[PDB]
């Protein structure tokens, strides 16, 4: 599971660490993914690089999760909710603004350690 | 709808401002999306971080749209055309080099305000 | 096709150069795509912006390939093989850590030169 986070700049180093750590925790508790398979990446949006509803310079925090298809609806809703709550508890940005997206991948398309697809592993 | 733009370094602040503003317009007018729901993000690619058909240091401008399933072909073709046109008008990079990608998300996978998906939102 | 590389900071200029050039070669050789169609983009992850299995400050190299639907499983496996191998040969990051993802696009979803889709071109 890949968690790619887009945040507007302004967070301290402490907040970044906490955001990524608790996001990883959120994935583990939501869909029961092993920690060894969880990765979080942070992309920071500089000033004027985020247009929100026609407004510049607004706080932003968006989650995108790349994962192998097959998760149940309950798992998806739990994942969206956990990451959204994590983001707000960490950054202070309300869930009304925080967004989370889920992207499905066929096992044949998800390469794994040693450079083979998840289907080849029969993951 | 999320519009994520990847552009090579070199643009002025004014053209950056122009790029995102008109990108927002392109979305509103192509698929009839409410302005309140339209977001545009910009990522700048430094020199040597963009390889174009074997060549480094060439101008780059690529659009990626993340949005919910259900749009007609006409809407989708219009969105691609409008973003391509917008990109050329604001940066000077010809539509021959400009690129637009679309991502369909099922309502079950697209989170909304309040940490709930579009499907659960009903 | 689009090859978007996410890599932790630390690579020299010449290694970044080889990585992009050989990732392009990997695409051309694996799926037989013309050189004129291959694009490679590099996103560099600063310190503390990549969490790997609960640990910060680890080397990271992740490939995401955005491309049109229709490629065979044979090509997909070969592409994942070529990029993973390229990633290690260039950066020195072992294939056990290197990751390659493949993302299918409907022909109507892939904009081409001139602001029309691949489907509109007749592909």
Author numbering:
A (entry chain F), C (entry chain A): 1 to 123
B (entry chain C): 1 to 122
Question: What are the paper's exact sentences on this?
Answer:
The percent identity for each pair of sequences along the similarity path is 42% between 4-OT and the Fused 4-OT, 41% between Fused 4-OT and Linker 2, 26% between Linker 2 and Linker 1, 31% between Linker 1 and CgX, and 33% between CgX and cis-CaaD. Among the characterized fusion proteins of the TSF, only two enzymes showed substantial 4-OT activity, Fused 4-OT and Linker 2. There was a stepwise loss of this activity going from 4-OT and the 4-OT–like enzymes (Fused 4-OT and Linker 2) to Linker 1, CgX, and ultimately cis-CaaD.
From a structural perspective, the functionally diverse members of the TSF share a small, structurally similar core domain that comprises a β-α-β motif. All biochemically characterized enzymes in the superfamily fall into five reaction types, each of which uses the N-terminal proline either as a general base or a general acid. The domain structure of the TSF is relatively simple, with nearly all of the members represented by either a single β-α-β structural motif or as fusion proteins composed of two of these subdomains.
